[PDB]
Design a protein around this ligand. Structure first.
Ligand SMILES: N[C@@H](CCC(=O)N[C@@H](CS)C(=O)NCC(=O)O)C(=O)O
Ligand SMILES: N[C@@H](CCC(=O)N[C@@H](CS)C(=O)NCC(=O)O)C(=O)O
Lengths: 199, 199
């Protein structure tokens, strides 16, 4: 129904969860991508000087997870009951907590590459085992229906595999889960048309 | 109506936003506080091995902001419309993004004290000016009614003032806002009865 304008860098990054939700709900929007070179001109015009932001009817929303949660309201993706909605939120928060540990902006490319290494080999196995245990034998994180938490797992694991290709080898269940998310038609189409980018 | 069991350390920390919401809604709950010494015994029994957690009818919820958002649903505290709910969420996320930068677990008490210094003197002014600009002359962040975003500002600014006492001197509006939150009867009562703790 309404017109949407997503603004972010030409990368999956923080905006990708929003792009998945739009794809799934078949909601049209302008996927406005900017190059790093353009950022300096744009940054000062945004509320809290950061992206992504969503222009909705001339109102600029910010914060990717706040926007994702807003787009999924009164939708099954958010979770059917209030208890499930909290569980969906908790999983996205657990995954985001981890991805936030990565020093993506680290200037020192030595320390960075060395921290990435620690994270990927020391902490990840703990996150993965709890996540695996949580998922158990359910079809999706929450149960028998897909939620935006499952989308987030696909989004997060994609970048992580770019970092450490063999990261998921010991977790077939987590593998099957991301495979399932990727098989959903609306997502498969998006994945194929989406710009090939590293992060 | 239902029985609640909050589990966390004896500190405001991550669980304080939940304690504010309970106080305001006048919902009874067991405020179970544990000492650091007990943590090792408890940690392995929790889903993702972290606190706070909320036991509701024998179901363990986790992630403070996921729980806070669940408790505030179908309540004015969450924001009246879907657009305002997104804005309330976004403010909480902006404030949490910042507080997360603080290396609270830093072993190296030199680096830590030195990073805290940087954050407090270089980044905070930027967060504070955007926050101030956002609030403008509204009574509360969202407008003419209190939301859990306002609670969060009181919670976050409390710890920050423990760090840098003169941090808010240049922002009278942000000061008036936290003073207003503190004047709400249910909050005033909580503040007075809550255990005096540093963080
Ligand atoms: N939690 C926020 C984080 C926003 C954020 O840090 N965005 C970065 C890009 S990943 C940004 O705006 N960088 C440009 C800058 O801060 O100068 C969100 O998810 O939207
Ligand atoms: N974003 C999470 C953070 C959880 C977290 O880091 N909790 C800390 C206490 S503030 C914890 O569990 N510490 C014990 C440990 O990790 O060993 C939340 O808000 O619940």
């Amino acid at each position: 129904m309404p017109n949407y304008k997503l603004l972010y860098f030409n990368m999956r990054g923080r905006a990708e969860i929003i792009r998945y939700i739009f794809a799934y709900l078949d909601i049209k929007y302008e996927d406005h991508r900017i190059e790093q070179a353009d950022w300096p001109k744009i940054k000062p015009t945004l509320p809290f000087g950061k992206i992504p932001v969503l222009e909705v009817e001339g109102l600029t929303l910010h914060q990717s997870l706040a926007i994702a949660r807003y787009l999924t309201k009164n939708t099954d993706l958010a979770g059917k009951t209030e208890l499930e909605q909290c569980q969906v939120d908790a999983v996205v928060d657990t995954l985001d907590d981890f991805m936030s540990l990565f020093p993506w902006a680290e200037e020192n490319q030595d320390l960075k590459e060395r921290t990435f290494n620690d994270l990927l080999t020391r902490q990840a196995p703990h996150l993965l085992k709890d996540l695996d245990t949580y998922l158990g034998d359910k079809e999706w994180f929450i149960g028998n229906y897909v939620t935006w938490a499952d989308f987030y797992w696909d989004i997060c694991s994609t970048t992580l595999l770019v970092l450490k290709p063999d990261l998921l080898g010991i977790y077939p269940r987590l593998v099957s889960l991301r495979n399932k998310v990727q098989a959903i038609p609306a997502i498969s189409a998006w994945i194929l048309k989406r710009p090939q980018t590293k992060l």
